[PDB]
Ligand binder design. Structure first.
Ligand SMILES: COc1cc(-c2cncc(-c3ccc(C4CCN(C)CC4)cc3)c2C)cc(OC)c1OC
Ligand SMILES: COc1cc(-c2cncc(-c3ccc(C4CCN(C)CC4)cc3)c2C)cc(OC)c1OC
Ligand SMILES: COc1cc(-c2cncc(-c3ccc(C4CCN(C)CC4)cc3)c2C)cc(OC)c1OC
Length: 283
């Protein structure tokens, strides 16, 4: 039988230190192709090792298609091929769009759903998985208004995370590194920051906040580890809740939820399953 492997690379939709992401075509269908820099080969290996362990399949997890290693004269080429989401990342989307109540809730509940699927062990099934780099650039927007979580290159099963989104116990190095629940609680902190980024873009009473990343007002671009530690650990700052949120029942409820993702004590934070339940009772 014929095995048609050729993928046509059509346009670059992302370039970074990690490498590049391309819109590609396979048998008439869009795929996304991540081409890894040699500097970040371990991210390809870890994501491949995870998918070789458990073939994750969930509407709110970026859909795996293939992992390819190709021999070159002087190098190894590493590609990850996934489903293609033409609307791009949540980070991108929130810059050019405001949200109504239904669309805000649908976004955040879909992220909570993907995250709970990663976190929870299924027996007989899947190991529990922590993401370790959850942020709005690692979430894609689907045409049906739900999102999916991308990039399992740091994931752990039961490179460091983006500093802006690191929990206090990562910044002060008190994290219990031998305890898998520690890693879930780091993801919950980051989830709360994403919930804040999204909630800002939800209109109420004709008001909306401009898109800003978490801590935009207290750290520089590309904040250092020390910049983040001083804000999050020493001063114990948290993102601002605008007064206008307290005129809107949805944003009032979301503010409470994000507060319960940001406790200094990791074991006080809500679980992904509890976040899902709370979001199903909002509106
Ligand atoms: C090697 O490389 C790539 C391969 C493919 C690809 C292309 N056609 C057909 C296939 C195929 C799938 C599954 C079976 C099964 C059939 C049932 N039987 C009991 C076991 C075997 C056979 C063939 C594949 C996997 C795509 C690629 O890119 C999208 C590849 O490159 C990464
Ligand atoms: C990698 O990705 C894609 C792969 C394919 C594809 C191509 N040839 C053959 C297959 C296949 C056939 C049959 C089985 C068997 C398995 C056991 N038992 C005997 C019942 C069923 C498995 C696999 C597939 C899945 C199509 C895709 O898209 C249309 C892919 O997505 C981009
Ligand atoms: C975060 O991580 C990964 C993401 C993806 C991925 C999947 N679908 C779509 C995208 C995308 C498409 C298009 C735009 C822009 C460009 C055109 N226009 C001006 C606005 C829209 C942005 C983003 C990406 C980047 C794939 C990955 O691996 C293959 C990723 O790594 C795991």
């Amino acid at each position: 039988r014929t095995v048609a492997r050729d993928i046509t690379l059509l346009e670059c939709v992302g370039k970074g230190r990690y490498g590049e992401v391309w819109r590609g075509s396979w048998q008439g269908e869009n795929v996304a192709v991540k081409i890894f820099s040699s500097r970040d080969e371990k991210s390809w290996f870890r994501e491949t090792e995870l998918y070789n362990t458990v073939m994750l399949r969930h509407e709110n997890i970026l859909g795996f298609i293939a992992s390819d290693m190709t021999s070159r004269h002087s190098s190894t080429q590493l590609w990850l091929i996934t489903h293609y989401h033409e609307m791009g990342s949540l980070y991108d989307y929130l810059q050019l769009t405001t949200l109504d109540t239904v669309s805000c809730l649908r976004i955040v509940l879909s992220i909570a759903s993907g995250l709970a699927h990663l976190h929870i062990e299924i027996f007989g099934g899947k190991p529990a998985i922590a993401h370790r780099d959850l942020k709005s650039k690692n979430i894609l927007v689907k045409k049906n208004g739900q999102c999916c979580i991308a990039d399992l290159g740091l994931a752990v099963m039961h490179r460091v995370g983006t500093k802006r989104y690191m929990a206090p116990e990562v910044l002060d190095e008190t994290i219990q590194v031998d305890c898998f629940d520690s890693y879930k609680r780091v993801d919950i902190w980051a989830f709360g920051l994403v919930l804040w980024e999204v909630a800002r873009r939800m209109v109420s009473n004709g008001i909306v906040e401009d898109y800003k990343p978490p801590f935009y007002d207290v750290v520089p671009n590309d904040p250092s580890f020390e910049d983040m530690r001083k804000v999050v650990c020493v001063d114990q700052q948290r993102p601002n809740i605008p007064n206008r949120w307290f005129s809107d029942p949805t944003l009032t409820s979301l503010a409470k939820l994000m507060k319960e993702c940001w406790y200094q004590n990791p074991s006080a934070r809500l679980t992904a399953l509890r976040i899902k339940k709370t979001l199903t009772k909002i509106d």
